[PDB]
Amino acid sequence: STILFNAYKKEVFTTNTGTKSLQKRLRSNWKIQSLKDEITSEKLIGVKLWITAGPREKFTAAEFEVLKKYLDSGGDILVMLGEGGESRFDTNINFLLEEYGIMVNNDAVVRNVYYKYFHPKEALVSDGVLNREISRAAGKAQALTFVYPFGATLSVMKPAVAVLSTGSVCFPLNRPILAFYHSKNQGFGKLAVLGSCHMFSDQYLDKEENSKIMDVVFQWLTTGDIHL
């Protein structure tokens, strides 16, 4: 029972920065601690979830093994990087995700028409929920708006499964944006890649039913009454 934000890879959001408002909703059920030194399989001992909010330094094949072990051990991981993907972020995180069928592309999602927000990349997505059960908030068969700021789209193929899309009014249209991996009886290791680290920051989490989305992404990671 500890949630671990990674911070030595020059992450964009660490516990010192950024995801300040996200922590308040987690320090309720968890012990949030940052990570400053190299990832050692022992270090991740208590950890229920490891998080990288927008890494910007490369990873070492040594560090990767540390994580694939940790994921097959029943650990959980959450990787979020942003607009422009690995080509604006200078990090080799894809080498790890490529094994689970997820790969963060290098493009930015934009809006169709101006509403509420300054920048074109502050994309507002009305019908992006893909799995029905992810309406673990209300609605069934109503909509769910979230603000998808400064983000890239994911290439998702099995075994991973896409669960949020850019929608029908953002561009690229209908391309995956959040992907999950539960597979195998490892048992029950869980990975979740999000196409943008900003979606959960203080700047946007409060704003547009992003908060319900967070709740669900974290109940699936931190399982959780969620089953696709």
UniProtKB/Swiss-Prot annotation:
The keyword Repeat does not apply. One of its GO terms (biological process) is neural tube formation. Keywords: Cell projection, Cilium, Cilium biogenesis/degradation. Induction: After opioid treatment, expression decreases. It comes from the Eukaryota. It is found in: Cell projection, Cilium. GO terms for cellular component: centriole; centrosome; ciliary basal body; ciliary base; ciliary tip; cilium; dendrite terminus; intraciliary transport particle B. Component of the IFT complex B, at least composed of IFT20, IFT22, IFT25, IFT27, IFT46, IFT52, TRAF3IP1/IFT54, IFT57, IFT74, IFT80, IFT81, and IFT88. Interacts with IFT88. Interacts with TTC25. Interacts with TTC21A. Interacts with IFT70A1, IFT70A2, IFT70B and KIF17. Interacts with USH1G. Involved in ciliogenesis as part of a complex involved in intraflagellar transport (IFT), the bi-directional movement of particles required for the assembly, maintenance and functioning of primary cilia. Required for the anterograde transport of IFT88. This is Intraflagellar transport protein 52 homolog. The gene is Ift52.
